[PDB]
Amino acid sequence: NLMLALLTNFTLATLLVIIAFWLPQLFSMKFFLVAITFLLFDLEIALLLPLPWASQTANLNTMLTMALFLIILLAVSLAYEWTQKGLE
Amino acid sequence: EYVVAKLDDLINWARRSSLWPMTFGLACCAVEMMHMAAPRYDMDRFGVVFRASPRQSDVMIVAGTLTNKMAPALRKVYDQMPEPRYVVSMGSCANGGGYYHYSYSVVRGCDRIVPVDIYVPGCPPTAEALLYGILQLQKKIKREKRL
Amino acid sequence: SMVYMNIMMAFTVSLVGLLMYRSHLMSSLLCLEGMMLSLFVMAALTILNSHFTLASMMPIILLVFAACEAALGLSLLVMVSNTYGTDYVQNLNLL
Amino acid sequence: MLYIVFILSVIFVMGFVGFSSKPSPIYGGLGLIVSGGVGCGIVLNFGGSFLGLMVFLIYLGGMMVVFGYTTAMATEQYPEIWLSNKAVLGAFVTGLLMEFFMVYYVLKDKEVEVVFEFNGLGDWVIYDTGDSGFFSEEAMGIAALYSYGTWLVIVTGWSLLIGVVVIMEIT
Amino acid sequence: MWFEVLPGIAVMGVCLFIPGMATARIHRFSNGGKEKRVAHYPYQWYLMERDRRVSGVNRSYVSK
Amino acid sequence: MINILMLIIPILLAVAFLTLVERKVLGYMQLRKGPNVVGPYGLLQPIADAIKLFIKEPLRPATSSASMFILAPIMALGLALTMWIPLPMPYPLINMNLGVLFMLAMSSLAVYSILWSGWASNSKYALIGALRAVAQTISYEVTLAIILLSVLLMSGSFTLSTLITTQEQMWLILPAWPLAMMWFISTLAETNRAPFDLGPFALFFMAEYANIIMMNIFTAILFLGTSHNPHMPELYTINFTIKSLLLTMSFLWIRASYPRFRYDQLMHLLWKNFLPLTLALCMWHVSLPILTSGIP
Amino acid sequence: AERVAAFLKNVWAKEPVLVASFAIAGLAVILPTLSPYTKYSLMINXXXXXXXXXXXXXXXXXXXXXXXXXXXXXXXXXXX
Amino acid sequence: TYKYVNLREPSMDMKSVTDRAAQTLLWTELIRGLGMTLSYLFREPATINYPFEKGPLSP
Numbered sequence A: 001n002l003m004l005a006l007l008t009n010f011t012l013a014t015l016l017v018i019i020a021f022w023l024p025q026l027f028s029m030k031f032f033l034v035a036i037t038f039l040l041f042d043l044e045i046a047l048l049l050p051l052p053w054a055s056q057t058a059n060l061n062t063m064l065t066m067a068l069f070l071i072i073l074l075a076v077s078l079a080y081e082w083t084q085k086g087l088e
Numbered sequence B: 001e002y003v004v005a006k007l008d009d010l011i012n013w014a015r016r017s018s019l020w021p022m023t024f025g026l027a028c029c030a031v032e033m034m035h036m037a038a039p040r041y042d043m044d045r046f047g048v049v050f051r052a053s054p055r056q057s058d059v060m061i062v063a064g065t066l067t068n069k070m071a072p073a074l075r076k077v078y079d080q081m082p083e084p085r086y087v088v089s090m091g092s093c094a095n096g097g098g099y100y101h102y103s104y105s106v107v108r109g110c111d112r113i114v115p116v117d118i119y120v121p122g123c124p125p126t127a128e129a130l131l132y133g134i135l136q137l138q139k140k141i142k143r144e145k146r147l
Numbered sequence C: 001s002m003v004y005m006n007i008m009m010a011f012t013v014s015l016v017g018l019l020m021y022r023s024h025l026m027s028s029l030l031c032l033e034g035m036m037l038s039l040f041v042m043a044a045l046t047i048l049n050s051h052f053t054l055a056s057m058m059p060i061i062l063l064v065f066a067a068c069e070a071a072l073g074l075s076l077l078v079m080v081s082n083t084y085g086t087d088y089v090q091n092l093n094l095l
Numbered sequence D: 001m002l003y004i005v006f007i008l009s010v011i012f013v014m015g016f017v018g019f020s021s022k023p024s025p026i027y028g029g030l031g032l033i034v035s036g037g038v039g040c041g042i043v044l045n046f047g048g049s050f051l052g053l054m055v056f057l058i059y060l061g062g063m064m065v066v067f068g069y070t071t072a073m074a075t076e077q078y079p080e081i082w083l084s085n086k087a088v089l090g091a092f093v094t095g096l097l098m099e100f101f102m103v104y105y106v107l108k109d110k111e112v113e114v115v116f117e118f119n120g121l122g123d124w125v126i127y128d129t130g131d132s133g134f135f136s137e138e139a140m141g142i143a144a145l146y147s148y149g150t151w152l153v154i155v156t157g158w159s160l161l162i163g164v165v166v167i168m169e170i171t
Numbered sequence E: 001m002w003f004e005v006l007p008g009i010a011v012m013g014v015c016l017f018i019p020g021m022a023t024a025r026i027h028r029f030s031n032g033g034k035e036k037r038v039a040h041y042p043y044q045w046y047l048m049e050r051d052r053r054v055s056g057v058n059r060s061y062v063s064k
Numbered sequence F: 001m002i003n004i005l006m007l008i009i010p011i012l013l014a015v016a017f018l019t020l021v022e023r024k025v026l027g028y029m030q031l032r033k034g035p036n037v038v039g040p041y042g043l044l045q046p047i048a049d050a051i052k053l054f055i056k057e058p059l060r061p062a063t064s065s066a067s068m069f070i071l072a073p074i075m076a077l078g079l080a081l082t083m084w085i086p087l088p089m090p091y092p093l094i095n096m097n098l099g100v101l102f103m104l105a106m107s108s109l110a111v112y113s114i115l116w117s118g119w120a121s122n123s124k125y126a127l128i129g130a131l132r133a134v135a136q137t138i139s140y141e142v143t144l145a146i147i148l149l150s151v152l153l154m155s156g157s158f159t160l161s162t163l164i165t166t167q168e169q170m171w172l173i174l175p176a177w178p179l180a181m182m183w184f185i186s187t188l189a190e191t192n193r194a195p196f197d198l199g200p201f202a203l204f205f206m207a208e209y210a211n212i213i214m215m216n217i218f219t220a221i222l223f224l225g226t227s228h229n230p231h232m233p234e235l236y237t238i239n240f241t242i243k244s245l246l247l248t249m250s251f252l253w254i255r256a257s258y259p260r261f262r263y264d265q266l267m268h269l270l271w272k273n274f275l276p277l278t279l280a281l282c283m284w285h286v287s288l289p290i291l292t293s294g295i296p
Numbered sequence G: 001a002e003r004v005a006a007f008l009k010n011v012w013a014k015e016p017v018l019v020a021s022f023a024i025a026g027l028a029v030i031l032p033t034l035s036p037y038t039k040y041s042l043m044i045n046x047x048x049x050x051x052x053x054x055x056x057x058x059x060x061x062x063x064x065x066x067x068x069x070x071x072x073x074x075x076x077x078x079x080x
Numbered sequence H: 001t002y003k004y005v006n007l008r009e010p011s012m013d014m015k016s017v018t019d020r021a022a023q024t025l026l027w028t029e030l031i032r033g034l035g036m037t038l039s040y041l042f043r044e045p046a047t048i049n050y051p052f053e054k055g056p057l058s059p
């Protein structure tokens, strides 16, 4: 069971907190541009995720031109990051 | 009855095993405190860890001279420390102003700011003599909380 | 049928959440995520129970575009906090 | 024991109540972790190995993490208790009672609904799927492919080029 | 020297040695032949279901 | 189901007994003696740190905002321990339908552990440094997904059990020569304190050092293997532990030998320099199964 | 040369990692078109069946026999 | 007296440029820096435990 496996880890993690809790008795907007680019790149990663699991039944010649195409534009988005990104 | 007396020593053994000191670079004494890291005379991972940190550390070594400018500064560090706290006044300046003393700026005794448990008398406090300060601290922890 | 009855009710709560505003502006973009989350469950179950194979890629594409509005509209939120002090629906100048 | 998905759907709505109500972006932000993580179980139970974990990767480990920045960038106001505030507790109690009243009607099978569709029971009929496929099984088992949908790949790549260029120009 | 370092490595050659062996040796007590079947896709899932139907009653994996 | 407890208790001991390795092996690098007084070779110290911090050490919170601060260590320890479940090993506990997707997911959610700690403190003084620590982890997770896919596209599906079978004669270090160099650096971003560094505070140590072993094991699956042997589980168990231990030495090697790269120039190593390199190798790894037949 | 020889050694000196970003990614497009090996990989991808093969009714058919091993249809046996 | 700290362009053409680029493309000198601590690990440490051993002194 996956449900039994996950819940056992969290319940033991909660118990460790109580041990320390119960027993003893006596600005800058330049960071934002980095965070946004993380999200926009990971969505291109999300489109490029199926590649090892997808390419099994589909035609290779039709895929080859389209598979590289996403990575090329992923570099063009980084090419726009070279024309003055900032001090970061 | 017998289990009560033996379990108390086990908690005291935990502090006898490892003690994390504060790295105060406020002295010439602090260079001798860096000789505790120097391999020839070591308490490093024998008990001492040089990670320090203002909150996680159990021990704080007041290294040498303290001025009236640092008198409110060192006091707020002591409040951030956990309840099992031991203060070592390593150096003659820390004991009661080795030099200066009668001077306007230097605070006499350190105990006027922060209470001291272990005193180390040496100006250039030789690493050999500095090894006593930690070993005596481990020996001084004998009995805590009877009832 | 039975499972769809609860998530459609969950969709209406997220719909009202978009249409409701009290001081804070951040709730709307949080509700936009929830609306797309509720649509994601509804889309998946229809293709999973009634098999399609080809159409199972469509919610994966929907997953990508859900984040596009929840980032490019989310970027505009920070621009409000650059012009004004903090983000407020109460703080608007246009008539 | 009898139901698997139906219990998770109640917790899904339970997390969503803090959106119609206004418990600040801190506690309101916490709702998407609760509703999202449980919301994966609703997707996963009928199938979808890839698509079920995409919520964890993007919606939970990407979307709301960027929203974690913006809460500190704009309107932080030091996080407050969501019980002392007026009308917030009123919106929360009315939000749950719209769904929890329907939960009582699930017993004795049939429940009253605003929509024309009936709910009935549907426990074994909840999945409504046979074995059918075996090798390379499930419609969501091969969910995404670059073939056939070639046009969709170009526009998605185009839209993600816009985002990087535009947001840089605003600031 | 290394004679001080090696007991720190040898204790890691016991604690990290557990999860590998405990997952493998449990298949002797749970299953008949020290093997657990992997699901992957409905093809292998259906074979697990019919094996229990082919005179096994409670057992999922059983020979003949 | 007893094996779950046989993958938490010996694992918590492995994080505990790291304190020996993390300052004795690091000690001989710096020509200093580590643990010696406490035990015969200092074996009593790792368990002595637990008695010090858990029971006797009290709490002094800054504000304690109802649910938070006493919820962040649960997310820290919980996500670090759940990462052990999908691990292939000789035999995995409850093998997932897809392996590596679960591995990348729980690591991306492990970013929250350092996020909620920044929200725990009421002061503005701490949160600016806290967001900077998020930036160290969030940025490297972009590349971490790319370098993973290039290894997968060479051979095998997402399942971690298939990754052992594909390494039968030769290791994956040789075909993925520049990609193996990346996993030495990219893993150190997740609070390892080697290229960049930022009661319940003690619980974060038990979670952060747990991820260090986790990245050591995960590198020894994607790149190392040597042999499988299904008939003999004895030969695999010993040989896997030695390979993982050698990578643990290299993790402590960077911590002692090399200074911090600066936060600004961490975004010059990555993004400016690494992201054009990783994608160019990703472009190369798309063509490889097409140029020569290599499909699982 | 004005751009071939001049803008090569300067690229290796100033920003040397950018040379690899254009060379490796560039050759990744050139190689799968010119090299005669890509045509073999496409055949094995189509030959490996995902689902069960369908049977057709026999009414005047060539290169089609029984399920037993016989010279019929294509049947891939490329490289061992 | 003068000693000079500046190298004044170590790379000139072709052969001298590539090896200066190789150390920045991959690492090399970091792996060479790794080897410095590697041999330093094997050699015996000079450590004195105080309750049993004693450090050097003078008359």
Ligand SMILES: NC(=O)c1ccc[n+]([C@@H]2O[C@H](COP(=O)([O-])OP(=O)(O)OC[C@H]3O[C@@H](n4cnc5c(N)ncnc54)[C@H](OP(=O)(O)O)[C@@H]3O)[C@@H](O)[C@H]2O)c1
Residues within 6 Å of the ligand: none
């Ligand atoms: N605000 C108020 O509560 C209030 C109001 C009106 C008047 N007062 C007066 O002001 C005084 C306040 O004192 P307090 O309550 O602050 O003192 P306290 O905190 O109880 O401290 C007294 C200390 O003396 C020790 N002690 C006392 N009797 C002992 C015994 N028989 N055996 C061993 N150890 C003993 C205790 O040590 P151990 O803990 O180790 O045993 C304790 O640490 C009271 O005496 C009261 O008459 C107080």
Ligand code: SF4
Residues within 6 Å of the ligand: B027, B028, B029, B063, B064, B065, B090, B091, B092, B093, B094, B098, B099, B122, B123, B124, B125
């Ligand atoms: S006691 Fe001596 S060595 Fe120490 S701070 Fe004072 S003058 Fe310096």
